[model samples]
Every structure is written in structure tokens, then in C-alpha cells.
Target chain A: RVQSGKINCGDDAGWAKVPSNDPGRDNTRELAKNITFASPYCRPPVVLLSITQLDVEQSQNLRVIARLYSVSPTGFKASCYTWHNTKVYSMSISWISIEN
Target chain B: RVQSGKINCGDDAGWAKVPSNDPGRDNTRELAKNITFASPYCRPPVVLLSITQLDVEQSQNLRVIARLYSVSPTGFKASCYTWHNTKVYSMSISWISIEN
Candidate 1:
């Protein structure tokens, strides 16, 4: 459903909030990057990126590989979780795009 | 990935589709808003919003902030989950716009 047939990429970052005191518990955050194209459906074609984040100590030490998820022709997305049991601290995105 | 650097945001809300009866268990809901700008990719840039929802009662009261998830140049989105074992009663979005 890549009706626009063009995919662009960029960077975005922000601070996330937690509800409980266990913000240090094992957790992973999901971050999304927007696309320049508008498609017919709520899904995108492809994405490439380098996701970065901070550790529990405000040390910008955590980084992981992001993957594509629900993408629209006009939007793209990725979701990541703490498989290793590290709570989310902070997050950012350095993303790439792929389109027809 | 943003082909169209013009990012946009708006409000969107809906009754989330649930699978089981434990709508009162710890849970979060995801809602997406449609976009007016078409992009080259399937991702949007940014989103700012105050997510509001009712509690699991005939009389309910609860409000919380939501985080950005999947975004498009033409669409915006956010997701929030419960922390104190309270379930998602009902939901809506009050969003802001930020673009380049």
C-alpha cells in the first residue's frame, strides 16, 4: 500500500515517564519515526535505523537494534523491548527509509 | 523516515478492541489519528497529547499522559498502559502539533 512510493528518514528523541517507582526494572521502550509519504493503509514498506538510549545512571549507555512494525503509507514505525531485563531510561532515533 | 519534512499532529480516540473480560487488569491502549499530509515513507515525526480515559466503573475517573509510538507525516499516534493494576475503562486523545 505504498501509494506515495517514496520513503524518507530522520531523527527524533524524547524523555519517557514511568508510573511506578520501579522505573529501574527490566523494560524496553518503543519509539517511532515519521514518513514523508502517505499510503492507502496504516502500514509502511521498510525502515532502517540506529536506536539509542540512556542507562539507569543517566549515562547514555544503552543502545539496541530497532525493527519495523505497523507502517502506513504516510507513516513508519518500530517497537523495542527489554529482552535482557533492563528498564527503559531514555530514547532516541536515527532512522533510514526505503521505498518504491 | 520523513520524505516530507512537514510534520503534523491531531486528536484521535476510539473504543479499543479487547479480547478477554479482564479489561480491568493492567493494560494499555493504542490509538492513531489520520493525517492531512502524505509522506514518502510510513512514519511521522512527533506527537504531544494528554490521554484521558474513565475508570472501570459505572462512575469512573482517571487521566494520564501517553507516549508516542507509530507516527506518519499524514498521521500521528500514542500509547499508554496501566500501572496500578487498573484496567482501561474508556479512552480519548487531546493532542498537539509540532512540525518543521
Candidate 2:
């Protein structure tokens, strides 16, 4: 009974982009290594990362430019938007993918 | 903060038309691979993948017509399956794009 779902990204924050939510310090070195750049133009950068509060809110902070950071979540790509000190919480993410 | 959850799927696991969960192994890769089959007949694929799982159940002894290799915090693709070999937990995988 394979279950699957997609996060309709609004801009750049779409799945595949780095710092995916509280990436626990988006460090691509050892932690997020699997999340390596799949493509040059398609995915985000491979810079070592650590999700600071400033990073997560990076979207809300820039309302106008938020679209760029709120891309959509695709198959296999992580698609949950959340930032927390620890405990897991849920954030609502909408997209223009579904035919609706 | 941000946290997202989405899963929903049921299928024809006769293991008949077995497909590739991994793009590297199959062009019809589910959730991850960059290229989303610009065209083809992809059945229930996942979008958000944690890579980790088991389709068969232990107590139920129910043989799942599903397949998932190994993907640690990253292998096969993890979800709350029914606690089978890898652990066929439970889920709510939503379908999208109308293509898959």
C-alpha cells in the first residue's frame, strides 16, 4: 500500500531546494549528502547549510520575493515546510500543480 | 516553522508490472529523480520520499505487490507502513499531476 503526496511549491522553496525547512543546519557535507545537486540549473546550490531561524522565515520575510523561495514539491523531493527548535509541527503549503 | 505531511496510494501489486522506485535504476523513478517522465505511464509514484520501508506485513503475513529497495534516512522511501519487513506502516499518499 505505497503512499505518496506532493508539496505544491510556490517558488524556490519547492522541494529539492536546500535548507528544506529546519534542515538542522542544512549541512550538505554529511547529513544532507543524499540531497546533492541532481542538476545544475534545476536544483539549488550545494553549499554547506544549517537552518537558522532567519533561513526558514526567509520566505515570509520577503513577501515579494517569497515566490522564488516557495517552489513546489515533486516526486521523491522532501515537501513539508516547518521550522522548530525540536518538536515536529505542521505548516500548510499550497501549490498550483493539482488540476483543482 | 515548517512541517509538511502527505501520503495516499493503493495499487496493482501483483508485482506484475513492477516499476523502478529509483530513477537511477528506472527512468520512471518515483519522487526523486529530476526528470519527471516528460511523458509515459507512471503508476502511483511518491513525491516526498524519505527513502526507507517494507511493503509486506509480519502478523498479517500479507504479501504486498509493492517493492522498495534500501534507503536509510534515504533509501527505498519511508512512510508509516503496516510494519512489514522494512515496515509497511500506514499512510495517506495523495496522487497528483494526473500523469502518474
Using TM-score, give the best candidate's number. 1
TM-score of each: 0.27, 0.20
Shift in Å, residue A59, candidate 2: 35
lDDT of 1 at B6: 21
Best by DockQ: 2
Worst 10 residues of 2 chain B by lDDT: B26-35
lDDT (10s digit) by residue, model 2, range B1-100:
1122333332223112225453322212122112232333335332333312323333332212211222222212422222122223432332122221
B1-100, model 1: which lDDT tens digit per residue? 3222222222223434333333433444334334443443344444444433323321222222243456666665444422222334454444433342
lDDT of model 2, residue B100: 19
The C-alpha RMSD in Å for every predicted model, in order, reads: 13.7, 15.8
lDDT of 2 by residue, A1-100 (tens): 1222222332233333334334353321111112212222233322211111111222122121112232222212233333322111112232222211
In TM-score terms, candidate 2 sits at 0.20
